[PDB]
Ligand binder design. Structure first.
Ligand SMILES: CCCCCCCCCCCCCCCCCC(=O)OC[C@H](COP(=O)([O-])OCC(O)COP(=O)([O-])OC[C@@H](COC(=O)CCCCCCCCCCCCCCCCC)OC(=O)CCCCCCCCCCCCCCCCC)OC(=O)CCCCCCCCCCCCCCCCC
Ligand SMILES: CCCCCCCCCCCCCCCCCC(=O)OC[C@H](COP(=O)([O-])OCC(O)COP(=O)([O-])OC[C@@H](COC(=O)CCCCCCCCCCCCCCCCC)OC(=O)CCCCCCCCCCCCCCCCC)OC(=O)CCCCCCCCCCCCCCCCC
Ligand SMILES: CCCCCCCCCCCCCCCCCC(=O)OC[C@H](COP(=O)([O-])OCC(O)COP(=O)([O-])OC[C@@H](COC(=O)CCCCCCCCCCCCCCCCC)OC(=O)CCCCCCCCCCCCCCCCC)OC(=O)CCCCCCCCCCCCCCCCC
Ligand SMILES: CCCCCCCCCCCCCCCC(=O)O[C@H](COC(=O)CCCCCCC[C@@H](C)CCCCCCCCC)COP(=O)(O)O[C@H]1[C@H](O)[C@H](O)[C@H](O)[C@@H](O)[C@@H]1O
Ligand SMILES: CCCCCCCCCCCCCCCC(=O)O[C@H](COC(=O)CCCCCCC[C@@H](C)CCCCCCCCC)COP(=O)(O)O[C@H]1[C@H](O)[C@H](O)[C@H](O)[C@@H](O)[C@@H]1O
Ligand SMILES: CCCCCCCC/C=C\CCCCCCCC(=O)OC[C@H](COP(=O)(O)OCCN)OC(=O)CCCCCCCCCCCCCCC
Ligand code: HEC
Ligand code: HEM
Ligand SMILES: CCCCCCCCCCCCCCCC(=O)OC[C@H](C)OC(=O)CCCCCCCC[C@@H](C)CCCCCCCC
Ligand SMILES: *C(=O)CCCCCCCCCCCCCCC
Ligand code: FES
Ligand SMILES: [Cu+2]
Ligand SMILES: [Cu+2]
Lengths: 103, 54, 160, 163, 139, 158, 223, 312, 92
């Protein structure tokens, strides 16, 4: 997105390819890097910081990581599809998201 | 369906024997004839579902 | 087998009209056991040789591939004994984890077989799971040398 | 698709329209309708001919300028009509799938695409030889007729080929 | 668990106040009356925190002061038998994979891959739950 | 990345028989010839009609449509200077609806050509459409608008 | 009709002039010109919903229609008046014909389907894959008018079947076969989609083989 | 100094924009003061390095300064309260909703371009007996007597008896300045008059921004049904000339291609333009007739080509 | 407690004195555990060569060739890293 925006023209990106980029950049950074890494740090030191040996449900927190990983991957999987990832921004506003728009 | 299960179970049996080493020194000829059997089953199903001109 | 013969439809030849050379469908797959041969046909990259006034079509490539597959499968125990050196009379099996190299090789071979089997189904995979047909073909082409190696390494380390 | 009687009917260029594909067969006047017993065997032979079926494609006049032509196949096309063998050059399945506005003849058996705009050369998939191009023209009354025979063997390749 | 319950009690008080004020100021002084989305969300997050705080308060009254809650509590006071914390298990990854196969089946509207992902999820959840209860094989 | 700068859907011509000639300020769309042929050729001396739609691209106009003639002596009956950010519809392609009981300037600029040369369906015949802005060869096709199949004689086996 | 033309124009001006420029001329590299496409093309495309299209990609996917039958007719009439071209079939009353398009012969329709349609769609009208991100969609959603108009106007990478190429009787037979194959119950159990080898092999490996392996694990003893 | 300190705010062209810009200048002044003091604190405590002279003695280790906490938690409250009071008084002039607008523009914003209707014009000085078009608004009530079933269903419609594809909320007008992909629309407005904008969207939510108005509003599909005050007024527009306008939301692929113009001309120029548009003429023709450039001068149409490296 | 320890005497027959050791593969004596590193290096190099060679084909596409180049490059990079590290004694 930054390389494309350097020059006024559409040098190497299409309109919808760019739209997919900020959609996935916004969500990946928030929902697949920011929100899953607070629990990455929590799992890292929170039991240590309260003196506990482990988390309350240590098989559950294992499931949480794998749900994060595989849930994240299938969102990224939009790219491999011919259409691409989600056009609508990270916010994914209603009318633009329905089957009519961004099908 | 029996043909499909025949092929699938031959494949699973081959996996079992190969991974558990049920072929070395003795039973190596058994593995050989089993491989021939798997190939024959493959081509048998090939001719089978090809039998009704479709 | 009877339950599945009842409840699940297999080969609706009535739907599949009579053979005519001019007619064809989009699926065009063989049963899952020949699906790996068909996938090899699909994935192999259209390499044809033309000797002096002759042609060597891409079919020979897949034919030789099948020949090699069957030869290796038939001759594995002798290949394994030549490589390792063990001709001892073995009556006790060994857990697949206890033989990392052989379980790794078997995992690699199963990965290649699955890759070919799904390459044969790339048409329906592309149709249902929205992935371009060229993308599926080239995923198979690259994987059939990448995926076996990845699965070999992963299986070896997993066994250890 | 008429069940048995007059299965093959003469054809005219006007029948197809730009971006149209029609499967055609080599019908002779002697191979009349299937009413007679003598006929309906010639017609069955025509239908069952492995190398018989051809696909006639009406190249859009706008895209007619993108057409490249093969050696000795430059005059084969009749105006904007191109007749290519349906049998895929690799293992002989029909290449019946046709994509207009892309001009790609796709084969379902092993996903090989041939660029109909150019001589039907394979631009993807296992196929390595272009589909044979049938010379076509119009006789008296305007009916489409082959202007000759394929200048190469049409089915899938084999050892004794390219000479 | 006095502080643990009081945290949620404070959250409940604040969220109830927010829901009430939002409902009032949206019923009047809004373009189209009550918003009915923010109002419901605020009411039921008040309900979330209220349920949690009520359970925590019940437990606080049911349990005597734990060493954890007790200032000046020695380590030996809490020293004892901690309960069962699940050791290594490979069922969580299978549950995640099954739920991912149901999720892709929902995304790409494939009833067959939804049906199988759900079967897959049932199987893996059963495996996880029965992991430490499957008695020895009886032959 | 089928959605990139080169995508299949965007770069598609209309699924119509008429060709498109964007050269020049005025763009020619669905330009074809209504020349119903009863035999191999449409013999010279018969009048066939020239359908197309001339759409103006710029509002600053190119409404002249001077000659647009080629081999065949194309004549524009009821000629008018229509294109001003709009469409000039020379004829009535099969299926065309008049859209009103009355009409403007009688025929809507019908273009008709006395062949002076055989033509047949499937061939492309060059026409030089020349507006005051410029001239462009279009290579017009022959289109059978909505006529059904002409009954071919039944075949006698031999 | 005057008011129908006006309504079609108003819908066009606030729906598609950004990619099928006003005057129906196509926007270079955004959409083709609609001159000559006709009313049938508009009906099929908008009714299937493809046309309120919000991306340029390998193929325009289907979607819920953005217009009701009256607005579809208005847009089709507008496009037909501007360009002039194929018209959607209609019944005696005037509504788009649905049952009238069911050809009497189904064997002939199936033969024609296999020769022309199954080439890419399927043996029985399930979907098919195409070169680069394209695909022939399943026909089970399409109604007889939609199938007929799809043949009449090659929507996208689909050959355009004129009435001369496929006489309306042949198209009616093909429509009858499509609807019959779509609405016909699978004899012999659950047809796993419509593709034989691949869904059948997966169902074997998942249903039959897991059953067999689980039963073997029940009977035998782990060691 | 004001322009530099406004952080790239275009000097407003309407009193609402002027007042909003003044509020922005004040807010930026306050924010920069707070930032300066806090950054000074940070760069000062960065001077409390671990001096080598610090022997085996740790710092005061104080923490928990309740009076200081109270001071620094009451002062920010007062600061934000002053900001909130200024914000409320400024927001009061966000839509005064004057019941006597001088020109009403029906701003329809469809998929990737604009359309301006000129719903009504009524100059306070006395002129412009003009109105919009009540016809052309056709509903989609699917009130068929019977549906697929035999009887009883008598379905009226999904929502309030109407199908989702209704477009009755969309209002139409006689003078429509529709914007084509190759011809950027230019809504021409009279200078010095009260201009109301009735905002609507044909297909999808998107935005309407005139950077020189220092104000934007989200054109919603059905604002009245969504409980949205789409309509908004501008008391005046002093400066004349052409001002670019963007779409300030997400619309779809060609979201960056929705640029339009607002051309503020003199009231007499607007008289001539509206008369010559009532006479059959396009927007460019009317602009040329009133002797003003026809094409959007602040923004050229975007190349419909998907990009630079596309082979034409 | 309800488990009995296992005594196993499997017939053995390379003698494992060279190659891999139990510290690296605990069950070295129980089965084939060592693949010569040369085999894997040459296999990776030939896989990269095959990926590069697939660029030569009847495809007008170019992202395919670029994907082949990338995958071959990473394969060659891994093989080179492994070979260099083992040459230097697993350093850096
Ligand atoms: C919406 C998505 C639904 C999410 C539902 C799961 C979230 C619940 C998590 C919090 C509950 C407390 C907890 O820690 O769970 C324990 C446990 C974690 O175990 P652990 O970490 O190793 O620690 C040991 C336990 O604490 C030791 O305690 P335990 O192992 O004995 O747990 C007891 C109950 C624990 O209590 C519960 O979790 C109540 C179960 C209510 C969930 C019902 C699903 C409702 C959603 C359907 C609509 C969508 O366990 C059970 O015996 C009943 C489990 C039944 C789950 C059924 C889910 C099937 C979903 C498919 C339905 C098909 C219809 C749709 C079509 O979590 C689970 O067993 C649930 C599995 C996760 C399912 C995700 C589905 C994707
Ligand atoms: C690349 C890396 C990313 C991979 C992403 C794929 C993740 C999923 C595959 C891994 C799941 C299995 C696993 O972790 O290995 C356990 C297992 C080792 O278990 P262990 O605890 O060390 O066993 C020691 C003793 O045998 C005694 O230990 P034990 O007491 O615990 O018993 C043996 C254990 C061992 O059981 C197994 O090995 C079951 C294997 C399940 C494979 C599921 C395949 C899912 C497809 C993934 C595609 C890749 O216990 C059982 O559960 C036996 C009952 C069989 C249950 C079968 C349940 C099917 C669930 C289907 C749910 C639907 C999910 C669809 C998604 O690993 C294997 O031997 C299998 C190799 C990995 C499978 C490759 C799949 C291709
Ligand atoms: C349709 C038929 C009904 C579908 C539901 C059948 C599953 C219930 C039985 C599973 C539990 C079991 O076999 O052990 C209890 C017991 C086995 O006792 P044992 O083997 O002597 O000792 C087991 C040890 O505790 C050793 O304990 P362990 O921890 O090593 O693992 C025990 C066991 C189970 O451990 C687990 O991994 C638990 C998770 C599996 C339970 C699945 C429940 C939900 C299934 C819904 C749909 C299935 C797909 O391992 C298995 O996975 C056995 C194969 C059953 C797989 C079920 C399908 C996948 O078997 C029974 O009570 C009757 C089982 C009869 C054989 C049928 C199994 C295969 C048929 C299902 C597949 C059909 C696909 C078509 C749909
Ligand atoms: C364990 C043994 C039991 C085996 C299952 C046996 C189930 C018996 C079902 C009852 C008797 C047979 C019903 C036959 C009537 C019938 O056929 O069933 C269709 C449904 O079909 C679907 O959608 C699927 C719905 C989802 C439920 C079934 C899913 C079961 C799968 C998961 C089993 C295989 C395992 C694969 C594992 C996958 C995971 C792999 C890792 C329903 O009609 P419809 O939906 O409209 O079909 C469309 C035409 O209309 C339309 O034209 C046409 O164009 C199509 O669109 C067509 O779908
Ligand atoms: C068994 C599966 C595992 C395989 C393991 C091997 C892993 C290596 C994968 C290699 C990936 C190779 C991708 C490249 C392939 C390639 O070269 O094709 C391209 C399409 O690029 C792409 O999307 C690349 C997508 C790559 C994503 C790969 C995802 C891996 C998944 C499959 C892994 C999950 C496996 C699940 C296991 C299930 C277990 C089952 C038990 C271009 O086609 P096209 O579409 O025609 O593009 C035209 C423009 O070029 C042109 O400008 C423009 O004008 C247009 O014409 C445009 O169409
Ligand atoms: C981290 C890297 C980051 C790289 C990220 C770059 C992403 C940008 C890609 C596509 C943007 C949309 C444009 C879509 C159109 C393409 C642009 C173009 O036109 O570029 C000129 C020619 C083709 O000419 P053509 O007219 O397309 O026609 C042709 C036949 N007719 O290609 C060229 O030389 C230049 C190459 C163009 C793209 C190749 C990219 C493929 C994969 C790169 C490496 C994968 C690594 C895998 C690692 C394991
Ligand atoms: C880019 C967004 C887009 C918009 C929005 C859009 N179109 Fe199109 N239109 C296309 C493209 C691309 C094609 C050709 C490829 C395709 O149809 O998939 C096309 C083709 C068509 C066709 C078929 C042309 C043919 O030759 O078969 C019709 C009919 C049509 N458009 C009408 C409409 C109508 C009516 C609307 C508004 C209700 C509309 N379009 C909105 C882009 C669009
Ligand atoms: C040995 C392993 C065998 C395999 C793998 C196999 C496989 C198959 C398959 C898959 C079919 C297709 C059925 C269909 O499409 O409906 C088939 C058909 C058939 N098989 Fe076999 N078969 C085997 C053995 C046999 C035997 C021993 C006989 C005779 C005793 C036999 C007789 C037939 C016949 C007559 C058909 C034709 C049925 C039809 O056209 O529907 N097969 N076979
Ligand atoms: C060697 C093996 C290891 C990899 C080595 C380093 C691998 C490093 C890989 C650099 C890749 C560079 C790409 C450059 C793009 C290009 O120029 O061509 C543009 C093309 C036209 O655009 C596309 O078509 C799609 C491009 C997007 C790719 C989506 C892939 C998403 C993956 C998901 C489906 C999840 C899969 C699970 C994957 C699970 C793995 C998780 C890490
Ligand atoms: C069309 O099919 C897709 C268009 C998307 C083009 C832009 C892709 C951005 C890069 C995504 C990164 C994927 C993960 C990389 C793994 C190393
Ligand atoms: S049969 Fe045509 S590509 Fe193989
Ligand atoms: Cu916008
Ligand atoms: Cu918008």
């Amino acid at each position: 997105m930054r390389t494309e925006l350097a020059m006024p023209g559409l040098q190497f990106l299409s309109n919808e390819q760019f739209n997919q980029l900020f959609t996935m950049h916004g969500t990946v950074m928030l929902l697949f890097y920011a929100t899953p890494i607070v629990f990455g740090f929590a799992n890292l030191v929170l039991p240590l910081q309260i003196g506990a040996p482990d988390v309350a449900f240590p098989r559950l927190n294992a499931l949480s990581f794998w749900l994060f990983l595989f849930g994240a991957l299938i969102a990224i999987a939009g790219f491999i599809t011919p259409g691409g990832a989600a056009d609508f921004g990270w916010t994914a506003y209603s009318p633009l998201t329905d089957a009519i728009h961004s099908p | 369906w029996a043909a499909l299960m025949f092929a699938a179970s031959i494949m699973v049996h081959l996996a079992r024997i190969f991974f558990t080493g049920a072929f070395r020194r003795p039973r190596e000829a058994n593995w050989v004839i089993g491989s021939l059997l798997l190939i024959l089953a493959m081509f048998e199903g090939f001719f089978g579902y090809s039998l009704p001109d479709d | 087998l009877g339950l599945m013969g009842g409840l699940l439809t297999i080969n609706p030849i009535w739907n599949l009209g009579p053979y005519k050379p001019s007619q064809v469908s989009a699926g065009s797959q063989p049963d899952f056991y020949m699906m790996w041969t068909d996938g090899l046909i699909r994935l192999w990259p259209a390499w044809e040789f033309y000797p002096f006034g002759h042609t060597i079509p891409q079919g020979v490539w897949v034919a030789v591939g099948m020949g090699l597959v069957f030869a290796l499968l038939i001759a594995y125990p002798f290949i394994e004994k030549k490589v390792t050196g063990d001709d001892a009379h073995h009556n006790l099996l060994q857990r697949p984890r206890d033989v990392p190299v052989r379980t790794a090789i078997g995992s690699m071979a199963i990965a290649l077989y699955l890759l070919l089997t799904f390459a044969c189904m790339n048409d329906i995979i592309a149709l249902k799971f929205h992935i371009s047909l060229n993308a599926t073909t080239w995923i198979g082409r690259i994987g059939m040398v990448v995926l076996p190696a990845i699965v070999y390494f992963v299986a070896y380390r997993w066994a250890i | 698709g008429r069940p048995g009687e007059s299965p093959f009917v003469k054809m005219r260029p006007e029948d197809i329209d730009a971006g149209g594909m029609e499967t055609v067969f080599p019908w002779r006047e002697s191979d009349g309708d299937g009413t007679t017993v003598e006929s309906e065997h010639k017609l069955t032979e025509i239908a069952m001919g492995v190398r018989n079926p051809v696909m006639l494609i009406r190249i859009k006049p706008a895209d007619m300028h993108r057409v490249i032509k093969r050696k000795g196949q430059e005059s084969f096309n009749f105006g904007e009509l191109f007749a290519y063998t349906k049998v895929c050059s690799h293992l002989g399945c029909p290449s019946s799938l046709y994509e207009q506005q892309t001009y790609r003849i796709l084969c379902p058996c092993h996903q090989s695409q041939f660029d109909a705009l150019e001589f039907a050369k394979p631009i993807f998939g296992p196929a390595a030889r272009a589909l044979a191009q049938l010379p076509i023209t119009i006789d008296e009354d305007g009916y489409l007729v082959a202007n000759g025979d394929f200048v190469e063997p049409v089915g899938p390749a084999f050892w004794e080929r390219k000479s | 668990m006095h502080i643990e319950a009081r945290l949620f009690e404070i959250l409940t008080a604040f969220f109830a106040l927010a829901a009430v004020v939002y409902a009032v100021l949206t019923a009047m002084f809004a373009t189209g009356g009550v918003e009915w989305a923010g109002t419901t969300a605020l009411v039921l997050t008040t309900g979330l925190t209220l349920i949690t705080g009520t359970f925590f308060r019940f437990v606080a009254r049911r349990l005597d002061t734990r060493p954890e809650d007790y200032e000046d509590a020695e380590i030996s006071d809490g020293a004892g038998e901690l309960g069962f914390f699940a050791p290594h298990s490979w069922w969580p990854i299978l549950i995640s994979l099954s739920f991912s196969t149901a999720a892709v089946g929902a995304a790409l509207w494939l009833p067959w891959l939804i049906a199988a992902g759900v079967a897959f999820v049932i199987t893996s959840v059963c495996g996880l739950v029965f992991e430490y209860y499957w008695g020895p094989e009886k032959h | 990345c089928s959605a990139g700068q080169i995508s299949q859907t965007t770069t598609q011509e209309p699924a119509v028989n008429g060709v498109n000639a964007q050269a020049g300020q005025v763009s020619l769309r669905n330009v074809h010839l209504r020349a119903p042929q009863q035999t191999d050729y449409v013999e010279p001396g018969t009048t066939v009609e020239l359908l197309f739609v001339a759409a103006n691209d710029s509002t600053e106009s190119n409404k002249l449509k001077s000659i647009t003639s080629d081999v065949g002596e194309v004549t524009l009956t009821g000629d008018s200077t229509v294109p001003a950010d709009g469409v000039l519809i020379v004829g009535e392609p099969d299926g065309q609806i008049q859209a009103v009981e009355n009409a403007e300037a009688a025929d809507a600029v019908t273009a008709e050509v006395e062949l002076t040369k055989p033509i047949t369906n499937g061939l492309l015949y060059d026409f030089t459409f020349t507006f005051e802005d410029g001239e462009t060869t279009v290579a017009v096709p022959i289109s059978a608008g909505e006529q059904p199949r002409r009954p071919v004689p039944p075949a006698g086996p031999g | 009709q005057s008011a129908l033309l006006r309504t079609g124009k108003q819908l066009f001006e606030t729906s598609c002039v950004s990619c099928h420029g006003a005057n129906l001329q196509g926007v270079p590299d955004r959409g083709p010109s609609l001159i000559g496409t006709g009313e049938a093309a508009v009906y099929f495309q908008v009714s299937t919903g493809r046309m309120p299209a919000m991306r340029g990609e390998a193929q325009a996917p289907s979607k819920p229609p953005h217009f009701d039958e009256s607005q579809i007719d208005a847009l089709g009439a507008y496009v037909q008046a501007n360009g002039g071209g194929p018209t959607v079939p209609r019944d005696d009353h005037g509504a788009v014909a649905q049952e009238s398009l069911i050809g009497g012969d189904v064997a002939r329709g199936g033969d024609l389907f296999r020769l022309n349609c199954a080439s890419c769609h399927n043996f029985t009208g399930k979907g098919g894959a195409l070169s680069s991100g394209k695909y022939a969609p399943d026909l089970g959603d399409a109604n007889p008018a939609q199938i007929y108009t799809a043949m009449l106007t090659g929507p996208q990478n689909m050959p355009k079947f004129s009435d001369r190429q496929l006489t309306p009787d042949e198209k009616r037979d093909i429509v009858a076969y499509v609807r019959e194959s779509a609405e016909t119950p699978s004899y012999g159990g659950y047809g796993l989609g419509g593709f034989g080898p691949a869904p059948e092999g997966m169902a074997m490996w998942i249903i039959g083989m897991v059953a067999a392996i689980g039963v073997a694990m029940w009977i035998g003893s782990r060691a | 100094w004001s322009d530099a300190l406004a952080l790239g705010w275009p000097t407003g062209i309407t009193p609402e924009a002027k007042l909003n810009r003044e509020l922005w200048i004040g807010s930026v002044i306050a924010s920069f003061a707070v930032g300066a003091i806090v950054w000074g604190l940070i760069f000062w405590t960065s001077a409390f390095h671990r001096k080598k002279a610090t022997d085996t003695e740790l710092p005061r280790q104080f923490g928990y300064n309740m009076p200081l906490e109270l001071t620094l938690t009451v002062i920010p409250f007062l600061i934000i309260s002053v900001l909130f009071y200024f914000t409320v008084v400024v927001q009061e002039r966000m839509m005064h909703k004057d019941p006597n607008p001088e020109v009403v523009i029906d701003v329809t914003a469809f998929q990737w371009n604009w359309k301006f209707g000129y719903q009504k014009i009524a100059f306070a000085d006395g002129s412009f007996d003009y109105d919009g078009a009540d016809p052309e608004r056709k509903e989609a009530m699917t009130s068929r007597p019977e549906g697929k079933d035999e009887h009883g269903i008598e379905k009226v419609g999904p929502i309030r008896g109407m199908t989702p594809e209704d477009r009755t909320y969309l209002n139409f007008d006689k003078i429509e300045t529709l914007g084509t992909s190759s011809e950027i629309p230019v809504l021409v407005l009279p200078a010095g008059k009260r201009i109301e904008f009735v905002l609507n969207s044909a297909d999808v939510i998107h935005g309407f921004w005139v950077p020189e108005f220092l104000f934007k509003r989200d054109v919603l599909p059905e604002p009245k049904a969504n409980n949205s005050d789409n309509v908004f007024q501008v008391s005046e527009i002093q400066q004349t000339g052409a001002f670019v306008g963007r779409c300030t939301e997400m619309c779809g692929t060609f979201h960056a291609m929705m640029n339009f113009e607002v051309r503020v001309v003199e009231p007499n120029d607007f008289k001539a333009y509206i008369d010559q548009r009532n006479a059959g003429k396009t927007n460019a023709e009317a602009l040329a007739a009133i002797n003003q450039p026809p094409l959007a001068i602040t923004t050229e149409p975007f190349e419909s080509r998907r990009g630079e490296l596309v082979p034409q | 407690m309800s488990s009995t320890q296992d005594r196993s005497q499997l017939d053995p027959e390379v003698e494992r004195h060279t190659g891999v050791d139990v510290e690296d593969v605990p069950s070295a004596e129980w089965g084939w555990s060592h693949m010569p590193i040369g085999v894997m290096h040459i296999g990776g190099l030939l896989s990269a060569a095959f990926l590069l060679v697939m660029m030569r084909g009847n495809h007008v596409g170019h992202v395919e060739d670029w994907f082949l180049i990338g995958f071959a490059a990473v394969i060659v990079a891994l093989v080179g890293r492994n070979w260099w590290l083992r040459r230097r004694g697993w350093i850096r």
